[PDB]
Design a protein around this ligand. Structure first.
Ligand SMILES: *[C@H]1O[C@H](CO)[C@@H](O[C@@H]2O[C@H](CO)[C@@H](O)[C@H](O)[C@H]2NC(C)=O)[C@H](O)[C@H]1NC(C)=O
Ligand SMILES: *[C@@H]1O[C@H](CO)[C@@H](O)[C@H](O)[C@H]1NC(C)=O
Ligand SMILES: *[C@H]1O[C@H](CO)[C@@H](O)[C@H](O)[C@H]1NC(C)=O
Ligand code: NA
Lengths: 427, 47, 259
């Protein structure tokens, strides 16, 4: 309380060293000439099942989208998105797109790369795979709470083509719904119906939407998992969470001890921890060594990096400190998607002949996700404690600084959620 | 004298400081004793 | 430190805090023996069972501190390390025998009211003071208790802690643990029938066990906080590395790497 917990600004502190001025830097000569081409080939596919290959590419798209999305919020804001929802929505919407409008989508979403992966892969495979994936994730219960809505809402004056109406339903277990955004009674009945269907988890689905909207994508998700190794509640204590090199904030910190996979990445200079949830899904926590190292971490996150981390982790008994938190976001991904190159789709002149015979303008892609993280989980994991104890500080994975987290479904390698917790005291 | 400290290392490799080691600026140097050193002295009360 | 009290300012000017450079966190204690050498426990730097295997570049030392977490401007001195040296016969597999290491500062540090080296014992001083019943002093910023307090934790001090403990007879130390003890370590702490208590705890390793010489009134580091079995338990004692018994090794390392 009457004590300060200071981060040490090493560069500032050591710059005062006497020999600072004697540093010999490098001159930027006339010319040099060198380089090294790219090609981020996917040899990650070797040994990967069909659904995993599609999810690896969906993840690749997810990280690029995150890259764009983060530059539209403050570095001190928390971030939460459900990548699988975004990818399935674009797959679904593409069922009614034609020409270049359709191509931008399949290109940027990396659906083109998937079809190209194998000779036996075609656009139909994508829709078939999404049908299967959707069933497994949202139409089955494996032990966690995953409620979601992922539909299209089209103003009634623009009749929806039959083939689209039925295809969306068949391959995505979703609906292209008739709507009347200018009618408050429609909004209320709809929000109310969605609440009942999602057993009270997803509320106000259609709130605050321009009454002149012609068409919009509605993607809302609610998630809450149960830890395999629960965090005992008596271990939950207030702990300082480092916001930046100058500020700290007290937060509820959960703590536990058990055998967890973890790794130290020297390339991206960060620590990675994996926490298992009941039902075959896990949370991957990434904490950069330096707080100024978040931007570079976000900048280089790719499926290849994640696989490298996964293989490098080792199981060892350790203590874990994770702050409990709850993120609730509501984004309009249109602007972000445009920046990624998907533009025709959001221009009235874009070709959506497959959806309606009328020209429809889509300006809203609502992506609203909610996640709650607390100590709830199955149970135990022995409260050992014995003799021999060297007296140095013990091995602990302490998540007390801004971190990123990835939630994957193990069997399909599906990136369900991705987020950044810059401040666990805010949502 | 037996109460005088005898150095053991070579300042060329040990660095400076051995000759004046174990004498605290804010205590011995100021003729001040800390609040519990006396307890140590009393325990050395022989063997 | 368990059952100790707040140290006074400049009470232990040779106290060094071992820090992980990135991310920043307290790792152990250590002590200043000259303007360029620091002494600590070997297991603070190398201990496979916990995947610890630091190098010079992963660490930092903070000298002249009092507060545990505050950056004490113009009082404390933060230094990088040039090289780390662990005793070649350090045995981390069985009993942490020869649990000792030397660290050379990247640049000599200036002394002040808060920074001053402790003396290393000569044969006679060690032979006279290392005896059952004689008390030494242990200092550190480690935990205040072994057991967890519901929704609070084990407790960390805001300032340096200190506690005086009596050296214990070898036979009693031997009978207190199933671990194999060696001539390179000694144990200290109060007997259950003595009433008083105190001990080192998690985070205090590497810190010094010092004694004030009654022969020349100078402070000597007789040991290094090494290990124990739970903190402050009745019938158990903390074990410390026997510094004088390893003085020859210290001399060797300093002779071929000091300049
Ligand atoms: C970490 O400690 C050393 C590194 O300090 C690891 O490997 C040795 O590293 C030194 C260089 O510092 C080399 O001289 C040795 O040849 C390395 N050993 C080899 C070739 O494997 C060591 O593996 C790690 N931990 C241990 C057990 O010391
Ligand atoms: C795309 O993949 C198909 C095989 O699935 C192949 O015929 C075509 O040439 C590929 N295009 C390229 C070069 O990416
Ligand atoms: C190590 O054992 C734990 C306990 O079952 C397990 O959860 C963890 O995944 C294991 N690590 C490896 C190597 O998979
Ligand atoms: Na004891």
């Amino acid at each position: 309380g009457e004590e300060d917990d200071d981060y040490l600004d090493l560069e500032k502190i050591f710059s005062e060293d006497d020999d600072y001025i004697d540093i010999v830097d490098s001159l930027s000569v006339s010319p040099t000439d060198s380089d090294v081409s790219a090609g981020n080939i996917l040899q990650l596919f070797h040994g990967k099942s069909r659904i995993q290959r599609l999810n690896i590419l969906n993840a690749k798209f997810a990280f690029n989208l995150y890259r764009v999305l983060k530059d539209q919020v403050n570095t001190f804001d928390n971030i939460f998105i459900a990548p699988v929802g975004i990818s399935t929505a674009m797959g679904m919407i593409s069922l009614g797109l034609k020409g270049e409008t359709h191509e931008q989508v399949h290109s940027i979403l990396h659906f083109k790369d998937f079809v190209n992966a194998s000779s036996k892969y075609e656009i139909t495979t994508i829709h078939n795979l999404f049908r299967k994936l959707t069933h497994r994730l949202f139409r089955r219960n494996f032990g966690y709470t995953l409620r979601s809505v992922n539909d299209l809402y089209i103003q009634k004056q623009f009749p929806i083509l039959l083939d689209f109406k039925t295809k969306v339903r068949e391959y995505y277990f979703a609906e292209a719904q008739i709507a009347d955004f200018s009618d408050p009674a429609f909004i209320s009945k709809t929000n109310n119906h969605i609440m009942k269907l999602t057993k009270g988890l997803i509320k106000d689905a259609l709130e605050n939407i321009d009454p002149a909207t012609q068409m919009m994508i509605l993607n809302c998700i609610y998630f809450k998992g149960s830890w395999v190794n629960k965090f005992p509640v008596e271990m939950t204590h207030n702990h300082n969470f480092r916001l930046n090199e100058r500020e700290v904030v007290k937060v509820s910190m959960m703590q536990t001890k058990g055998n967890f996979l973890a790794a130290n990445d020297q390339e991206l200079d960060c620590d990675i921890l994996q926490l298992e949830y009941v039902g075959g899904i896990s949370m991957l926590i990434v904490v950069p060594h330096k707080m100024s190292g978040m931007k570079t971490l976000e900048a280089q996150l790719t499926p290849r990096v994640v696989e490298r981390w996964q293989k490098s982790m080792t199981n060892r008994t350790r203590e874990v400190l994770l702050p409990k938190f709850k993120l609730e976001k509501n984004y309009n991904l249109v602007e972000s998607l445009k920046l990624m190159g998907i533009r025709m789709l959001f221009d009235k002149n874009g070709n959506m002949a497959g959806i309606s015979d009328q020209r429809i303008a889509i300006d809203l892609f609502k992506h609203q996700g909610t996640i709650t993280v607390n100590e709830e989980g199955t149970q135990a994991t022995t409260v050992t404690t014995v003799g021999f104890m060297p007296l140095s500080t013990q091995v602990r994975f302490t998540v007390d600084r801004p971190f990123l987290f990835l939630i994957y479904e193990h069997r399909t390698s599906c990136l369900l959620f991705m987020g950044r917790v810059a401040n666990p005291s805010r949502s | 004298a037996t109460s005088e400290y005898q150095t053991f290392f070579n300042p060329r490799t040990f660095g400076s400081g051995e000759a004046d080691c174990g004498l605290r600026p804010l205590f011995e140097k100021k003729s001040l004793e800390d609040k519990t050193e006396r307890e140590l002295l009393e325990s050395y009360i022989d063997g | 430190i368990v059952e100790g009290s707040d140290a006074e300012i400049g009470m232990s000017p040779w106290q060094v805090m071992l820090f992980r450079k990135s991310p920043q966190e307290l790792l152990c204690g250590a002590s200043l023996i000259s303007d360029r050498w620091v002494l600590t426990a070997a297991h603070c730097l190398l201990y496979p069972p916990w995947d610890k295997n630091f190098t010079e570049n992963d660490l930092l030392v903070r000298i002249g501190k009092h507060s545990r977490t505050r950056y004490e401007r113009n009082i404390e001195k933060i230094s990088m390390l040039e090289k780390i040296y662990i005793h070649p016969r350090y045995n981390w597999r069985e009993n942490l025998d020869r649990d000792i290491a030397l660290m050379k500062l990247k640049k000599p540090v200036a002394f002040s009211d808060y920074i001053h080296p402790v003396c290393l014992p000569d044969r006679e001083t060690a032979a006279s003071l290392l005896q059952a019943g004689y008390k030494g002093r242990v200092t550190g910023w480690g935990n205040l208790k072994e057991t967890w307090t519901a929704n609070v934790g084990k407790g960390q001090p805001s300032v340096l802690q200190v506690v005086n403990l009596p050296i214990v007879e070898r036979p009693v130390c031997k009978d207190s643990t199933r671990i194999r003890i060696t001539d390179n370590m000694f144990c200290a702490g109060y007997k259950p029938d003595e009433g008083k208590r105190g001990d080192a705890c998690e985070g205090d390793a590497g810190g010094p066990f010092v004694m004030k010489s009654p022969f020349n009134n100078r402070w000597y580091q007789m040991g290094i906080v090494s290990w124990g079995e739970g903190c402050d338990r009745d019938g158990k004692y903390g074990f410390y590395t026997h510094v004088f018994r390893l003085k020859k090794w210290i001399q060797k390392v300093i002779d071929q790497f000091g300049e």
